[PDB]
Amino acid sequence: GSSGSSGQLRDFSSIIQTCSGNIQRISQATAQIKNLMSQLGTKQDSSKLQENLQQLQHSTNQLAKETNELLKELGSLPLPLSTSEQRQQRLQKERLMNDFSAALNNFQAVQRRVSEKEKESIARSGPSSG
């Protein structure tokens, strides 16, 4: 893994590692929402949770915003003289993109469920005016 301290730059390895992490979190927070979800599903509810969800949501949101940004800055980086490192590079990113997705989708499928909970709350049926 990482061993040293001097360079300090958005290196492919520096970005990757970061990208990887982000993914985890995204998948993590997404898990908290699901884990916290049931919690709410206990007859009663708690704002302490509802808030946690959002916080976990937003957080992940941005996290992703960065990931995509990095994934962009990654490929942006130049290529080595050796073609061996060239493939290993894109190859890595290739997975990252996918991995990130698998995590993204998760959040999505979660976003829906959440929205649903908020859908029932508001509901809004049978208009009445006048």
From Swiss-Prot:
Coiled coil feature spans: 23-121
Record has ATP-binding as a keyword: no
Record bears the keyword Mitochondrion: no
Location(s), subcellular: Endosome membrane; Golgi apparatus membrane; Endomembrane system; Early endosome membrane
Taxonomic superkingdom: Eukaryota
GO molecular function: SNAP receptor activity; SNARE binding
Keywords, comma-separated and alphabetical: Acetylation, Coiled coil, Endosome, Golgi apparatus, Membrane, Phosphoprotein, Protein transport, Transmembrane, Transmembrane helix, Transport
GO biological process terms, semicolon-separated: autophagosome assembly; cholesterol efflux; endocytic recycling; intracellular protein transport; protein stabilization; vesicle docking; vesicle fusion
Consequence of substituting P78R: In a breast cancer sample; somatic mutation
Gene Ontology CC terms: early endosome membrane; endomembrane system; Golgi apparatus; Golgi membrane; intracellular membrane-bounded organelle; membrane raft; nucleoplasm; phagocytic vesicle
Similarity comment: family membership: Belongs to the syntaxin family.
Quaternary state and interactors: Interacts with NAPA and SNAP23. Identified in a complex containing STX6, STX12, VAMP4 and VTI1A. Associates with the BLOC-1 complex. Interacts with BLOC1S6. Interacts with GRIPAP1. Forms a complex with GRIP1, GRIA2 and NSG1; controls the intracellular fate of AMPAR and the endosomal sorting of the GRIA2 subunit toward recycling and membrane targeting. Interacts with NSG1. Interacts with TPC1. Interacts (via N-terminus) with VPS13B.
Function: SNARE promoting fusion of transport vesicles with target membranes. Together with SNARE STX6, promotes movement of vesicles from endosomes to the cell membrane, and may therefore function in the endocytic recycling pathway. Through complex formation with GRIP1, GRIA2 and NSG1 controls the intracellular fate of AMPAR and the endosomal sorting of the GRIA2 subunit toward recycling and membrane targeting.
Identification of the protein by name: Syntaxin-12
Species of provenance: Homo sapiens
Species lineage: Eukaryota, Metazoa, Chordata, Craniata, Vertebrata
